[PDB]
C-alpha cells in the first residue's frame with residue numbers, strides 16, 4: 001500500500017537536495033520581519049524602490065479579508081503584527097484611504113491604538129520618531145558591568161535575548177530619531193476612544209523595576225553620566241567579537257537588525273562588520289514566485305539536512321548511498337570547534353556542537369547537535385576516521401551540556417534564572433533558555449542510537465526529568481514543535497530507543513492520549529492555539545507533520561498493528577501529491593510559545609517519510 005507512497009516520497013526528497021549535498025527549506029514566520037526591514041532600510045538610508053515593491057506585494061498577499069495579520073495562518077488578528085505592517089505599507093506609498101489600509105486601521109483603533117502594542121513595536125516606532133522615547137522601557141549600557149554570578153547579568157538571558165539586549169543598550173543609550181517623511185507619518189494610530197490594554201512582563205511585573213525605569217529615564221536626562229561611554233564600548237566590543245561568519249548576529253533577525261542600527265549610530269558604516277552585516281542580509285531574503293519578497297527570521301540548513309538523512313535512512317536507503325555520503329561529508333565540515341557563550345558555564349568542556357544555520361560558531365544548540373550526531377551515526381562514510389572522531393566530539397559535548405535537573409536546554413546550561421522574566425522590557429516571548437522535554441527527548445534518542453540504555457546514570461536522570469514533566473493526561477509539552485503531539489511523539493520514540501519497557505503505566509497512558517485525538521480523516525492536527533487555550537491540546541486540522549509525529553508515538557509504543565495506526569498511514573497515502581510531497585497550510589513550528597510561530601517548509605515532506613519508513617520496518 002504505502003510502498004509507492006514511500007518511493008515517491010523518497011525520490012521527492014532527493015530532488016529537493018542541493019548539489020553541495022544539503023537540504024534547506026525556507027523558514028516561515030510573519031510580516032514583522034519585512035515590516036521592520038523596511039523600517040531598517042529607512043534608517044540606514046539605503047532604500048531600493050524595487051525591493052519595496054516586492055515587499056508591498058507580499059504584505060498584501062498576507063493580509064486576511066478582515067484587514068489584519070496573524071502570527072500563524074488561520075490565527076486571530078495580531079495587533080503588533082498589524083501595526084507594523086500598516087506602517088511599512090504607509091511608508092511605501094499606500095494612502096490611509098485605500099481598502100487594505102482602512103480595514104487595518106479600524107482594527108488597530110478598536111484594540112486601543114499604539115499604546116496597546118508590545119515594547120518592540122513602540123520602540124521601532126520610537127526610532128522613526130512616532131512615539132516618545134520616554135514611554136519606552138530603558139535598557140542602560142551599564143548592564144554590561146554586571147558580573148557572572150551577579151543578578152541580571154547578560155549571561156542570565158537566553159541566547160536570542162542576550163545579543164538583543166547588548167545591541168539595544170547602545171541604541172537606547174542614544175535615543176536616536178530618524179523622522180519619517182511628512183507623507184508617511186501615522187498619528188492616526190493614536191486616535192482611539194478604547195482604553196489601551198497594556199501587557200506586562202512574561203510573568204507579572206514588580207513595582208521596583210517600574211520605579212527603576214523612571215529613575216533610568218531621569219538619569220538619561222542628566223547633563224553627564226560617568227562611565228557611560230565605557231559601557232557603550234564594552235557593548236560594542238561584545239558585538240564585534242561575536243559577529244557570525246555570514247555577517248549576522250546569532251543567525252536570527254532581532255539582534256542582527258539592532259546591531260546594524262547600533263553601528264550606524266556610532267558612525268561605523270564604513271567599518272568591516274557593518275559592511276558584512278549589511279550585505280549578508282541578502283542570503284536570508286527569499287524571492288516569491290508571485291513577485292513578492294520575504295525575510296527569514298532564521299535559516300535551517302543544518303536542521304533540514306539532519307532530518308532528511310534520518311528520514312531517508314529509515315525509508316530504506318543504505319548507509320553508503322552516494323547521495324547520503326554527499327550529506328555526511330557536508331555535515332562534518334559544519335562542526336564547531338571553538339568556544340562559545342556556553343563555555344562561560346563549561347570552561348573545561350571541549351567544543352564539538354552544531355548550529356542551526358550555515359555559519360554560527362558561537363551559538364551551537366543541543367537540538368541540532370543531537371540530531372546531527374545521531375544522523376551521522378547511521379551513515380557509512382569513506383573517512384570513518386573523521387566520522388567516529390566527529391561523533392565522539394559531539395557526543396561528549398552534549399553530555400557536558402546536561403543541566404542540573406537531568407534535562408537539556410537549547411544553548412546554555414541551567415539558564416533557569418527567574419529574575420529576567422519580570423523586567424518591563426520583556427513582554428514578548430521567552431527570555432531564559434531552561435531545559436525542555438523535546439530537546440531532551442532528541443538528545444536521548446541520539447544516545448540510544450549508540451546503544452546506551454537506562455543503566456547509564458546520565459540517561460537515568462534524564463528519564464526522571466521527563467517522568468516528572470509529563471502532563472496529567474499523560475501528554476508532553478512541545479517547546480519547539482507545535483505542541484503535545486510533537487512533544488509526545490518525540491519523547492515516546494526516545495524512551496523506546498533507550499531500552500525502556502513501553503508496557504509501563506505512564507507510557508501506555510501517553511499512547512492512549514494519542515489515539516483519543518485522531519481526526520475523522522485518520523490524521524492528526526494541533527492548532528497553535530494549544531499554547532493559549534488548553535482545550536486545543538491535540539486538537540486541530542490534520543497535517544502531514546503532526547500526523548507523522550503521533551504515528552511515531554504509536555510505532556515506538558508497539559502499536560503499529562493498531563487500527564489507529566492503519567488510518568494514520570492511509571491519511572498520508574491519500575493526501576500525498578503526485579510529485580511525492582505533501583501540502584501543509586499550517587505552522588507546526590514554534591519559536592516562542594504563544595508569541596512567535598514557524599513554518600518549517602520541509603517538515604511536511606521529511607516527517608511523513610520518516611514516519612512511513614519506520615512503519616515498513618515494523619513488519
Ligand SMILES: CCCCCCCCCCCC[N+](C)(C)[O-]
Pocket residue numbers: 160252253254297298303356365367368410480591596
Ligand atoms: C524571533 C525570531 C528569532 C527566531 C527564533 C529563533 C529560531 C531559531 C531556533 C533554533 C532552535 C531550532 N531547533 C529545532 C533546533 O530547536
